[PDB]
């Protein structure tokens, strides 16, 4: 264990619409992957 996430830009965009950050925090929210990049 250490931080859960990194302070990467490395946004992503989830299967409900939501840019995440890094893919970390889209996976911590739990949703499935669906874009790269951010998403409006």
Do not use: I, M, Q
């Not at 931080?3 to 990467?8: G, M, S, W």
């Not at 989830?14 to 409006?40: I, M, P």
């Amino acid at each position: 264990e250490a931080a859960v996430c990194t302070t990467e830009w490395d946004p992503v965009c989830g299967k409900d619409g939501k840019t995440y950050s890094n893919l970390c925090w889209l996976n911590e929210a739990g949703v499935g992957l669906d874009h790269e990049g951010e998403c409006l």
